[PDB]
Ligand binder design. Structure first.
Ligand SMILES: NC(=O)c1ccc[n+]([C@@H]2O[C@H](COP(=O)([O-])OP(=O)(O)OC[C@H]3O[C@@H](n4cnc5c(N)ncnc54)[C@H](OP(=O)(O)O)[C@@H]3O)[C@@H](O)[C@H]2O)c1
Length: 317
């Protein structure tokens, strides 16, 4: 099952999330997921594993299990790299780590502009902005970054371009300046942060929405985030359990189906082989209108991935 992007390419509707994949088994896991049937891999410069991902894919291509053209590789431009002189440096490093000639989707990871740090100096940079333990920022409007991305599509290094973690007003302004329109909007999306109007906006413009953190706080419990600890797991939620029992499906299948059935692409992080199988078809069943209505009541605007936490960066205020 596939989503036709406005660029003309098809994006697999269910993918494999590469954030915080155990580093010692990362290449094996990618290979294994490809062999299990996953065709989209959601990666990023910031996840620090693009070499590992690229070896997984190398192996599966060499052993004949898949062709390059059957895979959909996503990556994301990190925040130090928005200046138009530096966009291509970061993309070239992603292409070399992945060992490919083009990437299928290249996203602006965040509408946040860290001071550039040369790649030989520190890669990937994280929060380092070339000034000690201090944040430092540069004045590069989004549209400058976007125009640099558009040249990289024209040069055949990227097929489709998009954005991650953009609010509505910012996306709307980007649409006014874009020649190639954004193909994808990738945002945090689970029942505790539903943002229904944002999704409605993006879909009405023909922009495919990718949900991340479909399991909500669970991904952030790994990092000991205070907010995530302190949140009741979605898996134990009384409504999610009623709905699971009603359809004979697991909580996790209900949480993923809630998005996939609304045409929203999913990219769950799938650590074990049964999870790999379970997460790859939740499209075995339909939620009904009463189900959506009961899940809609869980929305509390609880956001786990917020740059306000990093440095009071006002992306979501
Ligand atoms: N800013 C961005 O654009 C951004 C930010 C975050 C994520 N992402 C992307 O979206 C992807 C997915 O989001 P995520 O990594 O936050 O986590 P997620 O997919 O919400 O949650 C992953 C966690 O759920 C548990 N899990 C997975 N499948 C399960 C199942 N079938 N049953 C029960 N538990 C299950 C695992 O927890 P345990 O192993 O702890 O049991 C795993 O750590 C990322 O990997 C990344 O590619 C993008």
């Amino acid at each position: 099952p596939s989503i036709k992007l406005n660029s003309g390419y098809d994006m697999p509707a269910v993918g494999f999330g590469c954030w915080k994949v155990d580093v010692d088994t990362c290449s094996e896991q990618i290979y294994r997921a490809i062999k299990t049937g996953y065709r989209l891999f959601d990666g990023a410069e910031d996840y620090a594993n693009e070499k590992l991902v690229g070896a997984g894919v190398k192996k599966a291509i060499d052993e004949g299990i898949v062709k390059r053209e059957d895979l959909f590789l996503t990556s994301k431009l990190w925040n130090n790299y928005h200046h138009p002189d530096n966009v291509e440096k970061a993309l070239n490093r992603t292409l070399s780590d992945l060992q490919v000639d083009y990437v299928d989707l290249f996203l602006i990871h965040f509408p946040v502009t860290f001071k550039f740090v040369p790649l030989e100096e520190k890669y990937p940079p994280g929060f380092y902005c070339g000034k000690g333990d201090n944040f430092d920022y540069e004045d590069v409007p989004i549209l400058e970054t976007w125009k640099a991305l558009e040249k990289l599509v024209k040069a055949g290094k990227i097929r489709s371009i998009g954005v991650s973690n953009f609010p509505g007003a910012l996306l709307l302004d980007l649409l006014r300046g874009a020649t190639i329109k954004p193909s994808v909007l990738q945002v945090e999306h689970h029942p505790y942060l539903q943002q229904p109007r944002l999704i409605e906006f993006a879909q009405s413009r023909g922009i495919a929405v990718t949900a991340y953190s479909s399991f909500g706080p669970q991904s952030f419990v790994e990092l000991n985030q205070g907010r995530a600890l302190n949140t009741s797991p979605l898996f134990e939620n009384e409504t999610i359990k009623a709905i699971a029992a009603k359809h004979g499906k697991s909580p996790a299948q209900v949480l993923l189906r809630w998005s996939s059935q609304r045409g929203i692409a999913i990219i769950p992080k799938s650590n074990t082989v049964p999870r790999l199988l379970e997460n790859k078809d939740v499209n075995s069943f339909d939620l009904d209108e009463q189900d959506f209505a009961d899940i809609a009541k869980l929305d509390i605007n609880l956001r786990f991935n917020d740059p306000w936490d990093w440095d009071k960066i006002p992306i979501f205020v």
